[PDB]
Design an enzyme around this catalytic site. Structure first.
Site, mmCIF file in Angstrom:
data_model
loop_
_atom_site.group_PDB
_atom_site.id
_atom_site.type_symbol
_atom_site.label_atom_id
_atom_site.label_comp_id
_atom_site.label_asym_id
_atom_site.label_seq_id
_atom_site.Cartn_x
_atom_site.Cartn_y
_atom_site.Cartn_z
ATOM 1 N N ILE C 86 0.578 -65.989 -0.388
ATOM 2 C CA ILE C 86 -0.277 -67.002 0.216
ATOM 3 C C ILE C 86 -1.261 -66.386 1.208
ATOM 4 O O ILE C 86 -0.852 -65.718 2.157
ATOM 5 C CB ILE C 86 0.571 -68.061 0.959
ATOM 6 C CG1 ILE C 86 1.672 -68.604 0.044
ATOM 7 C CG2 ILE C 86 -0.306 -69.188 1.478
ATOM 8 C CD1 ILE C 86 2.673 -69.493 0.756
ATOM 9 N N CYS C 87 -2.554 -66.605 0.987
ATOM 10 C CA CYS C 87 -3.562 -66.167 1.948
ATOM 11 C C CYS C 87 -3.850 -67.281 2.948
ATOM 12 O O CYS C 87 -4.645 -68.183 2.679
ATOM 13 C CB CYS C 87 -4.850 -65.731 1.244
ATOM 14 S SG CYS C 87 -6.079 -64.978 2.344
ATOM 15 N N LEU C 88 -3.191 -67.213 4.099
ATOM 16 C CA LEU C 88 -3.323 -68.228 5.137
ATOM 17 C C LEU C 88 -3.278 -67.545 6.500
ATOM 18 O O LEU C 88 -2.334 -66.813 6.804
ATOM 19 C CB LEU C 88 -2.192 -69.249 5.014
ATOM 20 C CG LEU C 88 -2.164 -70.442 5.969
ATOM 21 C CD1 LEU C 88 -3.394 -71.320 5.797
ATOM 22 C CD2 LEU C 88 -0.900 -71.248 5.737
#
Ligand SMILES: [Zn+2]
Ligand SMILES: [Zn+2]
Ligand SMILES: [Zn+2]
Ligand SMILES: [Zn+2]
Lengths: 101, 99, 149
Positions: C86-88
């Site tokens: 997840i790119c967060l």
């Protein structure tokens, strides 16, 4: 702006209640206000950010600042260092008043 | 973990020293963390740049720069003092009708 | 220290009294440092109707370090790759020790509603999301029905 409204330029004090009245403090009445956002426990040795008036356990905020990230963990405002915080004995005192530890 | 406490035992923690009343719109000097009613401290800081309580200097030239609204403190006051909040609110309506 | 374990256990208590909307999380067994989560696809998205599972590993110095969170359910999304990575921001550079799993989960739900195509894990999907929304919704829903239902 700190300009006073028309109501404000005239407002009179809210006199203290001085009778035997007891306040019922239920476990959540002050949950948000008295809890350290970091450890999720009740504030201890409260330290308070000067810029944004957010409160943390001394050990918690100090650890967080040592763990690199120079922000108020609550709103993201720049914290240079420990000197951007101030111990909040008065806040501790209110807490000890209600919940002696 | 529910506890009952005499309001007169809480009062010292909930009262402005300037007006002698309960905090309304609690405002805190960031230099020392001493608090006051917004109106009480803003007016006072017009003719003094030192804290009314600890006498530390609030700012070199402009005291207002170094005070902040203290939402947490005021919320505490409004949640503990029964009726206080409604009363202050009514006080404002009864006034804005009259003006 | 046992400090992280205390923080983790309290979060678990809050989740019990205030189940977060559309999602749930907790220990996947006997180790409080290893959690599982489930997120229902937001109705304001092509993932609606889907149940997506995640895996969660808290570091020993949680909450001063972010938890490690990834999808185990395949999903078609600009910020999530086939590894479930997840790119967060809050998971990496924008972590705050004031954050909770509850907040992370709600943040991810938000990410599902409004992908961040400007910081893509899968450029090919960020592309389609920016140029052809109908194509994005179409494929996103198909994968949801196929893998998440
Ligand atoms: Zn802050
Ligand atoms: Zn703490
Ligand atoms: Zn006052
Ligand atoms: Zn002072």
């Amino acid at each position: 702006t700190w300009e006073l409204s028309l109501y404000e330029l005239q407002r009179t004090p809210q006199e203290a209640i001085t009778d035997g009245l007891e306040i019922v403090v239920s476990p959540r009445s002050l949950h948000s206000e008295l809890m350290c956002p970091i450890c999720l426990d009740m504030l201890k040795n409260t330290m308070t950010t000067k810029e944004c008036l957010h409160r943390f356990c001394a050990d918690c905020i100090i650890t967080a600042l040592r763990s690199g990230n120079k922000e108020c963990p609550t709103c993201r405002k720049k914290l240079v260092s420990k000197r951007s915080l101030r111990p909040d004995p008065n806040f501790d005192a209110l807490i000890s008043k209600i919940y002696p530890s | 973990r529910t506890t009952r406490i005499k309001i007169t035992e809480l009062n010292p923690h909930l009262m402005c020293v300037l007006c002698g009343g309960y905090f309304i719109d609690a405002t805190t000097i960031i230099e020392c963390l001493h608090s006051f009613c917004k109106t009480c401290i803003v007016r006072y800081l017009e003719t003094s740049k030192y804290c009314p309580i600890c006498d530390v200097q609030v700012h070199k030239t402009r005291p207002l720069l170094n005070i902040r609204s203290d939402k947490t403190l005021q919320d505490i006051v409004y949640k503990l003092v029964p009726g206080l909040f409604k009363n202050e609110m009514k006080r404002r309506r009864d006034f804005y009708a009259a003006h | 220290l046992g400090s992280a374990l205390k923080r983790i256990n309290k979060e678990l208590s809050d989740l019990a009294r205030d189940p977060p909307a559309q999602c749930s999380a907790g220990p996947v067994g006997d180790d409080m440092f290893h959690w599982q989560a489930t997120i229902m696809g937001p109705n304001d998205s092509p993932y609606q109707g889907g149940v997506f599972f995640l895996t969660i590993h808290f570091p020993t110095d949680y909450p001063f370090k972010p938890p490690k969170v990834a999808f185990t359910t395949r999903i078609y999304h600009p910020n999530i790759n086939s590894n479930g990575s997840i790119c967060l921001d809050i998971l990496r550079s924008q972590w705050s020790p004031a954050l909770t799993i509850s907040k992370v989960l709600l943040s991810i739900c938000s990410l599902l509603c409004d992908p961040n195509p400007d910081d893509p894990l899968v450029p090919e999907i960020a592309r389609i999301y920016k140029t052809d929304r109908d194509k994005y919704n179409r494929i996103s829903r198909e994968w949801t029905q196929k893998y998440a239902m």
